[PDB]
Every structure is written in structure tokens, then in C-alpha cells.
Amino acid sequence: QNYGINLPITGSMDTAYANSTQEETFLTSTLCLYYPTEAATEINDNSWKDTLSQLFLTKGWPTGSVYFKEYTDIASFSVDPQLYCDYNVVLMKYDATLQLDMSELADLILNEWLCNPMDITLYYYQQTDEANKWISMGSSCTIKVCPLNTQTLGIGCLTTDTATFEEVATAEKLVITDVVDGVNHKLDVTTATCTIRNCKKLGPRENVAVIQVGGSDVLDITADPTTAPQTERMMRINWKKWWQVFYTVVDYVNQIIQAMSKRSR
Amino acid sequence: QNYGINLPITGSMDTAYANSTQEETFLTSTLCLYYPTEAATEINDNSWKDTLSQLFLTKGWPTGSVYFKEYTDIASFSVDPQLYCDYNVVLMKYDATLQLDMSELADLILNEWLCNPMDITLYYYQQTDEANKWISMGSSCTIKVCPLNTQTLGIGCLTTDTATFEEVATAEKLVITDVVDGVNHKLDVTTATCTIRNCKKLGPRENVAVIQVGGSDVLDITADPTTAPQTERMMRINWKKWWQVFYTVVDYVNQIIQAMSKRSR
Amino acid sequence: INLPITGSMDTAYANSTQEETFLTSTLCLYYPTEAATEINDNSWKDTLSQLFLTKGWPTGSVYFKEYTDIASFSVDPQLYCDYNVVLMKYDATLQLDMSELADLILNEWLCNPMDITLYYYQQTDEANKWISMGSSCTIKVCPLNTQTLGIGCLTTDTATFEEVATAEKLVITDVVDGVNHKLDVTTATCTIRNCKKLGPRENVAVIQVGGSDVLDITADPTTAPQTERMMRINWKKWWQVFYTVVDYVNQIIQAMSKRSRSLNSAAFYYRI
Amino acid sequence: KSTIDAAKSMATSVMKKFKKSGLANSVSTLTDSLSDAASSISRGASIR
Amino acid sequence: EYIENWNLQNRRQRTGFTFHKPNIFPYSASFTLNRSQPAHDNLMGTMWLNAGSEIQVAGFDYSCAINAPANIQQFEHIVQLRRVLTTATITLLPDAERFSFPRVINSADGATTWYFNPVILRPNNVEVEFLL
Amino acid sequence: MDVLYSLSKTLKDARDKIVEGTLYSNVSDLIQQFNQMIITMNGNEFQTGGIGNLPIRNWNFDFGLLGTTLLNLDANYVETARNTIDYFVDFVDNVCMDEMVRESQRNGIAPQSDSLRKLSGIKFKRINFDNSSEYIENWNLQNRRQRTGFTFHKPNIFPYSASFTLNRSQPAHDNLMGTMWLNAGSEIQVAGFDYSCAINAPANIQQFEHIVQLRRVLTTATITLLPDAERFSFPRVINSADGATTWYFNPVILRPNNVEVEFLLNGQIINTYQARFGTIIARNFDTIRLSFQLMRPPNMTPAVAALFPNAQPFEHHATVGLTLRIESAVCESVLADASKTMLANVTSVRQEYAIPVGPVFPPGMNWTDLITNYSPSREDNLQRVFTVASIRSMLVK
Numbered sequence A, B: 001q002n003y004g005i006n007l008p009i010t011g012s013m014d015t016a017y018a019n020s021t022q023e024e025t026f027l028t029s030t031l032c033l034y035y036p037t038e039a040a041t042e043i044n045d046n047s048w049k050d051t052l053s054q055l056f057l058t059k060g061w062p063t064g065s066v067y068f069k070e071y072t073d074i075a076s077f078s079v080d081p082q083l084y085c086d087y088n089v090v091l092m093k094y095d096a097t098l099q100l101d102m103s104e105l106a107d108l109i110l111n112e113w114l115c116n117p118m119d120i121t122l123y124y125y126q127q128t129d130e131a132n133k134w135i136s137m138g139s140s141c142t143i144k145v146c147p148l149n150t151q152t153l154g155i156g157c158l159t160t161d162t163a164t165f166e167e168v169a170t171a172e173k174l175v176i177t178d179v180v181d182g183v184n185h186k187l188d189v190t191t192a193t194c195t196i197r198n199c200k201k202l203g204p205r206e207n208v209a210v211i212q213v214g215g216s217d218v219l220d221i222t223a224d225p226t227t228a229p230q231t232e233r234m235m236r237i238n239w240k241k242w243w244q245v246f247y248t249v250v251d252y253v254n255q256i257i258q259a260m261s262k263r264s265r
Numbered sequence C: 001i002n003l004p005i006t007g008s009m010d011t012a013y014a015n016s017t018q019e020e021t022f023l024t025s026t027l028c029l030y031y032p033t034e035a036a037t038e039i040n041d042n043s044w045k046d047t048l049s050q051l052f053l054t055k056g057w058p059t060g061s062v063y064f065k066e067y068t069d070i071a072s073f074s075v076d077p078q079l080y081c082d083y084n085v086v087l088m089k090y091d092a093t094l095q096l097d098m099s100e101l102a103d104l105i106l107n108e109w110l111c112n113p114m115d116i117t118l119y120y121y122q123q124t125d126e127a128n129k130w131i132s133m134g135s136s137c138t139i140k141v142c143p144l145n146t147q148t149l150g151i152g153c154l155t156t157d158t159a160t161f162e163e164v165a166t167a168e169k170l171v172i173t174d175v176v177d178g179v180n181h182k183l184d185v186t187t188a189t190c191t192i193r194n195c196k197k198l199g200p201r202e203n204v205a206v207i208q209v210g211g212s213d214v215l216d217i218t219a220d221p222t223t224a225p226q227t228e229r230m231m232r233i234n235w236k237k238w239w240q241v242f243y244t245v246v247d248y249v250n251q252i253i254q255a256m257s258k259r260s261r262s263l264n265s266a267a268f269y270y271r272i
Numbered sequence D: 001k002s003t004i005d006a007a008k009s010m011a012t013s014v015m016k017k018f019k020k021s022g023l024a025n026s027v028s029t030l031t032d033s034l035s036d037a038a039s040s041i042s043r044g045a046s047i048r
Numbered sequence E: 001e002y003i004e005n006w007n008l009q010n011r012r013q014r015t016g017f018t019f020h021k022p023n024i025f026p027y028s029a030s031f032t033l034n035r036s037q038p039a040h041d042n043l044m045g046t047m048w049l050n051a052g053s054e055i056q057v058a059g060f061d062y063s064c065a066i067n068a069p070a071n072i073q074q075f076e077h078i079v080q081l082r083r084v085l086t087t088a089t090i091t092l093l094p095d096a097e098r099f100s101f102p103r104v105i106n107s108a109d110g111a112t113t114w115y116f117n118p119v120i121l122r123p124n125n126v127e128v129e130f131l132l
Numbered sequence F: 001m002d003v004l005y006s007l008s009k010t011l012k013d014a015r016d017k018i019v020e021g022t023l024y025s026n027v028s029d030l031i032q033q034f035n036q037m038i039i040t041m042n043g044n045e046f047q048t049g050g051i052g053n054l055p056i057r058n059w060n061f062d063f064g065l066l067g068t069t070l071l072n073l074d075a076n077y078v079e080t081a082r083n084t085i086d087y088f089v090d091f092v093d094n095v096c097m098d099e100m101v102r103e104s105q106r107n108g109i110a111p112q113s114d115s116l117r118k119l120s121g122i123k124f125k126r127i128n129f130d131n132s133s134e135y136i137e138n139w140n141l142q143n144r145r146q147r148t149g150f151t152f153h154k155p156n157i158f159p160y161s162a163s164f165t166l167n168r169s170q171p172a173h174d175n176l177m178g179t180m181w182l183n184a185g186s187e188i189q190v191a192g193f194d195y196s197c198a199i200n201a202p203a204n205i206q207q208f209e210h211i212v213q214l215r216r217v218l219t220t221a222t223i224t225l226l227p228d229a230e231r232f233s234f235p236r237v238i239n240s241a242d243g244a245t246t247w248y249f250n251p252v253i254l255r256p257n258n259v260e261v262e263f264l265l266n267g268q269i270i271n272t273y274q275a276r277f278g279t280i281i282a283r284n285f286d287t288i289r290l291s292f293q294l295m296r297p298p299n300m301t302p303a304v305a306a307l308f309p310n311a312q313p314f315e316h317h318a319t320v321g322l323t324l325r326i327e328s329a330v331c332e333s334v335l336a337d338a339s340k341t342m343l344a345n346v347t348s349v350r351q352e353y354a355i356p357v358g359p360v361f362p363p364g365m366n367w368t369d370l371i372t373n374y375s376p377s378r379e380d381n382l383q384r385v386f387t388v389a390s391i392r393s394m395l396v397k
């Protein structure tokens, strides 16, 4: 059990495919859904959770392995999302005005970020690679940046007059900022109501699954404007009600969990 | 040093890979951004061009190589575009009501067209293949077409009565018209304001790169409805500000110039 | 292409590509308004096209493009056709203008833009010249010395500068190649561009309708050549001119050849 | 030929142009490559 | 040849059997992953089929050596024969075939599978060392 | 050299036939021959070596003949024979090792390793027993000019060449037409690729031709010709000609139509094969012409029509391949194979004793650089060293 190390693995091509770990992973794992308040609002039923649980019970998932966790709105969810389960599903409504925020949410939860803190009053920060971004959470973040030159002086901005800084956010609950990698930036931030963290995007999180409910696929996880990929756990649906959506999820929960895979870290 | 001849080339596979021509192509080339006036308006600054150039200087592009050329609107840009640089980037705002217009702009700039003129009042024209289209630029084009039969009589239209024609374009600044290939058409066009040209589509242009700053990817380069492709130099971003977009372009310029390659012609 | 070509003197002279280039090419004439005025007809274009249709050029291949004057034509000429013929009226007072036009269209230029106010430029070789187009160009130049000061002119007093062009629409300017000049140009009304002269443009054909052959394309006064596609007629009318062109169009296209460098609609290439 | 007129320090005058050219930059590139090859052993002689 | 080498071995001497396409390698199809995950989405490893007289080895990286140093990744395969050989005439070629198309391979423990969609490049810094 | 072969053969046949208990009626002739060889050798002093790590050995022959009194064989005869044969065997091995390593452009047939120049004398002519092997028979035939022949199984006549050729190229390498080939040993795997599936070409057809020119004539060749070349039928990233940039190649294999394989000789055609796949024959040829075509399928299902569009993107590139393996062959001259160890023996001797490079053979005797320039001097020296390597392999494999 050599943890903290990475060793060469080996195998063969003559070994046969083993049994189906389904009907056991459901029992020794847990499934957490994240629905919006609009769903329960439209529904207007108190026993819909027990109903979906008794339905899951047919697919194999036992009674107390399923969890439902409401969220009033996509931004309130983006505010410190704490996903601690063994299989997470996230039903996400589409709004053309919220596109960037509901893509930042995806880039935050679908992936696994290694996040170090940040202190703006003392230091001036720079990015090193293309995956070392700055994610800001809080209730209203107003972020301004002033890049510096080789000799610690601004570029189109002054290091005293914060009004001359360059604005990238304006009262956003979640922000993910990428800047030019190789230049030191001086920052202004609403530290009182927002925390900023310098995070490196590691390999992806195979434990969550986003399901867009409405419009066409728009989520550009990769900040670089060349890939625009569609990952396997990035699902779309077209909706007019919510019971049909929940029945679809329950009937196709095995494909979802096949698209997902228990975490590594 | 032969010109205008296509000769067989020859090489090998035991030849080794040469060095990175980046950090020299930057110095020996030129870059031209095409941003909309809304960007400058939102920014509300007058040193941002020099700021971006000083940033680019950290990526390798020298000072007198980068240029920013403004365009008030998609249609105004579409009116007689002239993209003459060694690397062109275009930031296109999304608008449902401008979908076909900004698809025709893409089909015009991304591709390379061999254009001959058109004298409507004298001749009756026809298309030979799926590439000989009719592109009309100007302030307000109002095009109407009557296909003719074997004996140069009209088909559901009267050669004399201009009103019986089939209007395919109503007061548009750029039209790209594909009609039935194999019949002789007679046109009515507001030639005082719009110039129309019979243009055969050659292979693509690898010098320009479109970047849809907003909504989903809708551009249908190919006039034919079956393929509906998406190329490498057709990018997409999600936006709420413009400083972030320009920072992203800057930080991932090398990916863009990898997606692009200088022109064959 | 950097590779070689190979051939043999035993091979056979193939069939005539004429009678097929006529079908898969386009022709475009440039006539003056004076011609249409003298003619006083409206269907003369369809007439000439129906006449070309005997010589082989099909219906939708021949085009006619009116130009009010030599200078208005020299202002940004956009020749976009696979074969171009130009009919050019002689005028002593316009000799240099219709020679600059010739040097512009018959040859293939590679142009870069020129910023007068922030920088100062020089010419390197005898093919790098400064061409200015617009409605009224007026160019003044002061050459400088090694220590960035004038030569018989003052860097500040624009009147001290030396006037090379006055009230011209097209100007081709060649100065001493190897000194730095400071320019004064009506940028609001004329844009100026540093253009290198590449090989010739085999797609156009100038036809001087009146006077003797005077066009000196090559700015050096030692060649004074007469290229193949530089023709001369003597005229008392325009119908005879057009009939002559139509009856001897084959020789003209034998004297011309489609371009080699690349495809482009204007009279020059741009490289920033 | 004539030490034409009370010239400046010609060694400095020539050197301030000398150290911008192919020769000196290639010398620096070579020394840097030798140092970089000497530095690490885990790269595996990656210059082929 | 056989009875001759028999008599030689009895009267000890340096014998020899001349073989054409000798079946000296035991059938071994197998892979080796030096950077693995549960979802098998970014892998680095080497795959080999040693069969009869032939070997087909192939080193695969899913990142194409973007994070590795100098944009290069090293792969090594050490075949340790059971008996010595001499005067071997060998044919070496690049771009092994049977590891050059889409594949669906089980992991070591035969519990889960992983996909493999290759793109063949040439091996550079190639070195073949015959040791004794 | 003939006497060297005869020495090796009588010594092999001695170590084989001369064994305890056997019958003198089976080895009377070989014993008369052995005694004759001993008589012809006794009184001579040879030297061997002195080039490279070869030690300088001096051979003296003072032996005693083998009695013919016996009517059955025994150990006191076999052991004498063996103690006399080991010395001759070491002598022959050292001679062959001193001969495989020497070269000359001036009459390379003429022997080097001066001990062999001596054995070529007239007094050593009494040792010829039988020149029965293929190599020595062809040697004798060449000396007495006649139609020779060496039979080969999977001959290595094609030098390793792995290269492409683009008859329509672009900087972005997005619409290409060309042919790729790997010619190695006995195999030719060629593949003509068009990225547009012959949409703009006349008759929806694109021609492809591969000409191969052999450095030596071949006859009675058995050939295995199949379609759908394998090593050029999967995704690939290749460099350009000048090696600066790279391009991609995602193939989709189709069948050759109008295929025509022409085996020619001096530009005149000899054998022709139209749409015949499998085992074919070629009786005399120095040139191969594989001319195939890529024909756009006129009738296409949706799944395949969605791959070959009328526009430039072209994310699937149509290919037409051909494998061609020369299984058996016959050659007037000498080559290498997959069946014989002659080249291996030569190269191993040279690598072991650290022979410097000579004026004829390239360094390490790499078959590519040694077949690409197969000039008469190289051919002569190669025949010589292959013959003596066969001689040495007859005794010490």
C-alpha cells in the first residue's frame, strides 16, 4: 500500500473480462442530485423525494443511498459549491444572460482545482502556465487588474489611482480570471465580501455530471478559444416539464454513472 | 524559382523534426485584430491598444507588428472587406437576427474566392458547379432572379415585368447567392448602390480566424445543407466583459497562430 | 516553386489552347466616356459581344468598363479579369500621367503603407518607389544628412521643402535611394505607399489610340523599352478602333498571358 | 590609413556592434547548450 | 546437422543449429502503464506483442509529451532471451501495425476497460542494443 | 578457393564418416583423399592474420598418413584422425576469417590473405575433391563464364526506403494527393492517397503509379500481391519535405480499380497482371510498375457519403494500397536472404575483430548502402566473402 508514490503497473491481454460491478457499486456508493427550486415549485408535492427513492430502488440504488440537495439559483450554487458525495448529478437551467456564469460553474465542478490562497495588499501576482487561473467566490466581486512592466510600473494604469485599473468583473458571485502569463498584476478586489484563490487546473473530476436542461450546448470548459470541447459527462436535455426530466434521469441513471467514475484524489 | 507550375515534391520519413519557427515568425510577420466599437466603449480607455502591444511584446510579437482595426458593425465590415495582413483575427459579436449575415461574412473571409464581374443588362448568367456563387456587396442590395427555360422564356416570371421576379435579398449589405446550377437566370439589382460579382470558391483562406464572442456556434460555411462543418479557425468564447476576452486572445495567441497558416496565394 | 522543371526537344507541339482559353477565360475592355459619346448608341456593347461570339469568345465572357478620364481611372484602378485591354487617349499635357498609369498596371507592385508623421523612409533599390493616389496629391520632400538635419531645407518650415508633385491624382515618386526623406503630403486627400516593382503583369494590354509611342515605364532614362503589350493605333473614330480590336483580338491574347503570382482584384499586392 | 581625426576608443566602438551579431550570439548559444547538457542527466540526451 | 551436433556435444565443441524464423519468444501480449488513473483518460505506457520470431512494441502517450521536459518522453523495452543466439539477421522497421488502430483493453485486474485511439508518429532517438 | 572448399568438405566428411566401428569400404576414397591432402600440405608453412585484432598465427604441417590395413575402424584410428583434423579445421577457420575481412577494387575476385594466393598454386591442385555446393559451383561457372544462378527465399534486394511524394501540395496540407511507399527487404507496401476522393478529377478517377528499379535482375520470382497496404492504413503525423512542419493523415481504405502490375526488363514489358491478386510469377524483370487508380464510389450510403464532401475540410482521406512480397527468387548475382547466415557471419567477424573500413565495403556492411551502390567491384568482393563464409559455416556454424 505504497501511497505518496507512483509505480509502473503491468498486466496482460489474455485475462477475461470480469463480472458486472453494477448492482454492487450502487449498494456501496451514494448518489446526490442537485435540482433547482423551480422543479419542486412546479411539482408542488411533499413526497416526490420518497417517490424518486422508491423508483431508484427498482434500478438497484437502495433507499438511503440517494440524496437531494436544493439550490435556489445557479449563482447561489456557484457561491462555494461543496460537492461531497460518491456520484453527483447537477441539473442546470439555461439562460443566455447567465451563460458565462454557468460555464464557470462547469469549469469549477467538472474539474479538480488545486487552490492556493492569495493576499493582494502585500504581493503582485503573475501566472506561470495556461491552467493557473484566479477563481473568485463571494456575494459581489468587483475585480480590477493593472499589469506591470519589467520595472514595476503600470501599463495604461497607475499604481495609486485604482480608477485607472482595468475591470474584468463587476458584481459577480463567481469569477474565473485568466490573464497574460508572464506579467505581474496588481489587483483590486472586494476582500470583505469576496475571497480570491490562485488555482491550478489538474486533471478532471470524474465524480460530477452536469445536465443542461434547455438550450443548445454552449459550455466552453477549456478557457483557450481553440478546443470548445464537449466532455462525456456534459449532458443536454430539452424540457417542458420536470417530472419527465426526473423520470429520464432515473431510467438512464446507469448510463450516467457509466459516464462518471469514482474519484482518484 | 518556378512560378505557376505544380511539380511533384519528394521527401522521406527518417528526417528529423526541425526547431520551433515560433518566436521568429512573430518577429517576421504581422497581426491584425478586428474588434467592434462596443469593445472600446465598454473599456472606456485610450491606451488599451498600446497596453495590449506591450503585453504581446511578452509573447514575442514586437511593437510595430500588431495592429487594431475597428469596425462599427458586422454589416458595415461586410461592405467591401479588405483583410490585408499576414495574420488576421476577427472578434464577431453574436446576434440571432444577424445569423445569416455573419455566416455570409464568415463564408466570404474564411474562404478564398476567384471573382469575375457581371453585366446584368447585357447577358443572362448561369452557374456551372456548386462553387460558382454570386456575391453582392454595397449599401442596400435588393436582388431578384428569373430562371429561364430552353427557349429563353421565363419560368413563372416575365422577362419584361420586373415585379414578377423572385426576390431573394431585401436591402442587405452582403448577399451570397447560390441558385439552381444548370439554368440561365436574368437578374434585377440596384446597381447604383450594390456591385455583384460571379465568384468561384477556391480552397480556404488560412490567414484569417473568426471568433464568435457570444452564443453557440451557428456558422454554416458550406452553402450545401448536408455537411454544416466546423473548422479549426472558427472559434467561440463566452463573454461578460471585453478586457477578459482580449487577455484570453493574448494569452492563447500562439494556439491561434498554430490553428492558422500563411496564405498559399 | 523552388524545384526544377525538365523537358525534351523531341516532344510534339500540342494543339492550340486558343478556342479553349476563349471559353474558360474572361475579357474586359476599358474605354473612355468620349467613345460612348461619339458612338451615341446604347446596344453597342451587346453588338460587340455578338461579334466576339464569332471570334469564339462566348456571350458571358466579354465586359466593358467605362472610365471618365485617365486620372480618375489611375485613382485606385481595380482590374479584376483574366484578360484586360485598355484604350488610352494621347495628350501631351497628360503624357506623364498616362505613363505612370502604364507603370502601375503593366507591372506588378508589392506595396506597404507609409506613416509620414511618426517615421521617415528611404528607398533601397531602383525598384522601390513611392506611389500616391487620390483626388489631389501634393508632395513635398526634404532629404536629410547623417546627423538627422535637412539639406537645403528646414525640418520645421514646410515651405522650405522641395515640391515634386502639384495637384496630381496619381504620382509615382523616385528619389535618391540611400538618404532619409521627410515628407509633406495631403494625407486627408491622398494615401501614399512604398511599393516594390516585381516582374511584369502579363494580364493587361495598353493601346495608345493617338500619338506616337512615348510611354517610358522604366524610370531609369536608359532602357525606354517598348514591351509586347504596349500597342499603338491611329484614330479618326472609335467604331473603327473597336472593330480593329475585335478583328485582331487573337494577336492581343497571344501577346498577353494569364498572371503567375497570385489572385488579386486590385492593381497591386499588399503586405503591410 | 591616417588615424583620420582624433577618433574615439575604436575597440569600444567596434565591440558595441560586435556583440549583437551571429558570431557572438552563436557563441553564447553554444556555451548555453553545453551548460544545459552538462546540468541534467535525466533528460536522456534529448538533442538526438 | 542434428546427429553432428549430438556427436560434437558428446565430444565437447562449439555446436550450432541454423534457424530460419526461430520461435524463441513465448507469446506475450501485454501493456505497462507508468502514469495511470481510474478513468484511464491521460495515460503513458508501452505495449508489446512478442510472438515466435517477431516483436511489435509501441509506446503511447495521451498528452503527446506536453508537460514532460523538453517535449519528449522516453520508452524502453528490455527483452531478456532464455538462450543465447549468434549470427542473427534481423529486420527492424518503425510504426508497428497491430498497435496502430482503435482498441478496447482491460486493465491489469480485469475489472474495468479503457479505450485507445492512436496516432502514429516516428520514434526518434531510437537505439537498439544487443547485449550479452 | 576451390581447394579451400575441398579442404573444408573432406574435413567435414571426415568428422562425419570416420567414426568408431564403421566400415573402411565407406571411407576408402575419403582416406585416399585425406592422405593426398596431407602429402600436398606437408612441407609448407602458412601465415594468417595481421589486420585488426586478428592474431598473427603461423601454421606448420607435419603429420602422418592414415593406414589402409584395417578392415573395420577403431578408436586408435579415429583419435589420430581427429588430432589431425582439428589443426586443419583451425587453419581453415583462420584463413576464412582473414579472407572475409580483406578488400580490393583491382580484381577483387583475385584472392587476398596470401596463404590463399599460395593455396591457389599448381601443386595444391591435387586437393580438389568435389565442388558440389551452390556458391562454389557458381564461382566455377563464373570463372568459366556460363549462366549462373543463386536461389533465394525472401531476398533483401530492396534497400530501406520509406517516403512520400505529393503531386498536389499546400502549406496547410489540407487537400493533398500523393503516394507513400515503404520498400524494405523483400516487401513493397505502397499507398496512393487523395484527400478529395477524386471529386474534381475527370471521370471521378485519380491515377497512381509506383516505379521500382532493381539494382540486379531477377528471374523465376514467386510474388504475393494483395490490396490494402497495412502500415499506411491508420492515422499518421508526417513531416514535410524540408522537415520544418508536419501534416496529418487519417486514411479510409478503398480498393484499387484498373490495377495493372507490369514487370519489365530494359524498359520492354515482360509480364503483365490485370486485377490478379494472390500468388503470381515473374520470369525476368529489372523493373516493376504498379499503376492503380482511386475511383470515387458513384453510389454511396449515408454513412460513407458523410465522409467525402464537396468542400475542402476533408476529415477522411481516401487511400488505395498494395502489398507485394517476393517470396522466392533467382538471381545471376549474390544477395542476402531470410534463410542463410553468410552476411551475418561476415559482419560478425568484422565487428568482432574490429576491421577498419576499406575502399569497397561501407562501414559495418549495411545492406542498404551496400545494395544502393552494387558496383562490379562490390559485387565481386561480396561474392568472394559470401563464398568463403559459406565454406566456414560448413564447419563452424
Ligand SMILES: *[C@@H]1O[C@H](CO)[C@@H](O)[C@H](O)[C@H]1NC(C)=O
Residues within 6 Å of the ligand: A018, A019
Ligand atoms: C461471473 O458472471 C457469471 C455469469 O453471470 C457467473 O456465472 C459467475 O458466478 C460470476 N462470477 C462470480 C465470482 O460470481
Ligand SMILES: *[C@@H]1O[C@H](CO)[C@@H](O)[C@H](O)[C@H]1NC(C)=O
Residues within 6 Å of the ligand: B019, B020
Ligand atoms: C530549438 O528549440 C528550442 C525550444 O524552443 C530552443 O530553446 C532552442 O534554442 C532551439 N535551437 C536553436 C539552435 O535555436
Ligand SMILES: *[C@@H]1O[C@H](CO)[C@@H](O)[C@H](O)[C@H]1NC(C)=O
Residues within 6 Å of the ligand: C015
Ligand atoms: C490536333 O490537331 C490535329 C490536326 O488537325 C488533329 O488531327 C488532332 O486530332 C488534334 N488533337 C486532338 C487531341 O484532337
Ligand SMILES: [Ca+2]
Residues within 6 Å of the ligand: A100, A101, A102, A104, A172, A173, A174, A175, A176
Ligand atoms: Ca460569473
Ligand SMILES: [Ca+2]
Residues within 6 Å of the ligand: A127, A129, A130, A131, A132, A133, A178, A179, A180, A181, B251
Ligand atoms: Ca493564463
Ligand SMILES: [Ca+2]
Residues within 6 Å of the ligand: A156, A157, A164, A165, A166, B045
Ligand atoms: Ca486604464
Ligand SMILES: [Ca+2]
Residues within 6 Å of the ligand: B100, B101, B104, B172, B173, B174, B175, B176
Ligand atoms: Ca446578408
Ligand SMILES: [Ca+2]
Residues within 6 Å of the ligand: B127, B129, B130, B131, B132, B133, B178, B179, B180, B181
Ligand atoms: Ca450553386
Ligand SMILES: [Ca+2]
Residues within 6 Å of the ligand: B156, B157, B164, B165, B166
Ligand atoms: Ca413570379
Ligand SMILES: [Ca+2]
Residues within 6 Å of the ligand: C096, C097, C100, C168, C169, C170, C171, C172
Ligand atoms: Ca501624375
Ligand SMILES: [Ca+2]
Residues within 6 Å of the ligand: C152, C153, C160, C161, C162
Ligand atoms: Ca529648399
Ligand SMILES: [Ca+2]
Residues within 6 Å of the ligand: C123, C125, C126, C127, C128, C129, C174, C175, C176, C177
Ligand atoms: Ca529610386
